[PDB]
């Protein structure tokens, strides 16, 4: 790895600089280097890893959606323009799949197996579900069903731990439930499951807000608002 010669602490420091500079590809490379040092990640470091790759894959997903829409229009009275749209959509798709495979590979070697505390294990299992979900967004062939089940299985394991080990207002638990509800609505063709999960999650968090400090209340209610926004879109 090109980061093998850099100190762990220097990689973390540079990841934070890259974030400030909006250099998310660099940020992701630095955080991959940090993970590959083999030590477990702290809370802050897990969040840097997630921010970096979410921004990288987010740009790829946005580009893929633009190109897929153009390709779909071309296949409706539409003039034949050759293979270029498909080729370039495939190029972006392959790069997106490569990033997802990179993240999944870090989780499998060896972040998840070393994560014993609920906060870390739930975080990584949620990430596994998320990156399989991004793979499912672009999957078509004989792999779509297995990719969807991999996302579902990771989210479900994370949900089971989070319900046993975390309060209903915990921001990781809330973000997991939010993303699993999105999985149900957008990937698994299960809008009723999505709505039910978002509603129950929101209501159980509401009933636990009284236990929180002002700062924790702000953290939790920010994510609850996303659940409510989806419920407004879905109903």
């Amino acid at each position: 790895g090109a980061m093998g010669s850099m100190e762990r602490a220097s990689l973390i420091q540079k990841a934070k600089l890259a974030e400030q500079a909006e250099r998310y590809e660099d940020m992701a490379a630095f955080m991959k280097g940090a993970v590959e040092k083999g030590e477990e990640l702290s809370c802050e470091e897990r969040n840097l890893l997630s921010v970096a790759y979410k921004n990288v894959v987010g740009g790829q997903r946005a580009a893929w959606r633009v190109l897929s829409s153009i390709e779909q229009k071309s296949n409706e009275g539409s003039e034949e323009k050759g293979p270029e749209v498909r080729e370039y959509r495939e190029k972006v798709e392959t790069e997106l799949q490569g990033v997802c495979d990179t993240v999944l590979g870090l989780l499998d070697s060896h972040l998840i197996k070393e994560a014993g505390d609920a906060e870390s294990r739930v975080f990584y299992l949620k990430m596994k579900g998320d990156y399989y979900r991004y793979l499912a967004e672009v999957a078509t062939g004989d792999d779509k069903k297995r990719i969807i089940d991999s996302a579902r299985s990771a989210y479900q394991e994370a949900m089971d731990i989070s319900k046993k080990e975390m309060p209903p207002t915990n921001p990781i638990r809330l973000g997991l439930a939010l993303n699993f509800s999105v999985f149900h609505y957008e990937i698994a063709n299960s809008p009723e499951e999505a709505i039910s999960l978002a509603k129950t999650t929101f209501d159980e968090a509401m009933a636990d807000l009284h236990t929180l400090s002002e700062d924790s209340y702000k953290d939790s209610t920010l994510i609850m608002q996303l659940l409510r926004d989806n419920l407004t879109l879905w109903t």
Binding site: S50, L178, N179, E186
Partner: peptide, 8 residues
């Protein structure tokens, strides 16, 4: 309109 997922 696409659904909102977790923010960073």
């Amino acid at each position: 309109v696409r659904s909102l997922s977790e923010r960073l």
